[PDB]
């Protein structure tokens, strides 16, 4: 489940994160924008 409007990167350092262009954010949190 990925929301169109952020890019995501699942890094093997044991943490995946989503970047929102709409709010300018880098976060572990699952995007609510998605619904």
């Amino acid at each position: 489940g990925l929301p169109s409007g952020w890019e995501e990167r699942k890094d093997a350092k044991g943490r995946t994160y989503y970047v929102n262009h709409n709010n300018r954010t880098t976060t572990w949190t699952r995007p609510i924008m998605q619904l």
Binding site: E7, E8, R9, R15, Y17, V19, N20, H21, T26, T27
Partner: peptide
């Protein structure tokens, strides 16, 4: 957990 990489820099 060591935190997030800076915002909007995405190597694809």
């Amino acid at each position: 957990e060591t935190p997030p990489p800076g915002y909007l820099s995405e190597d694809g």
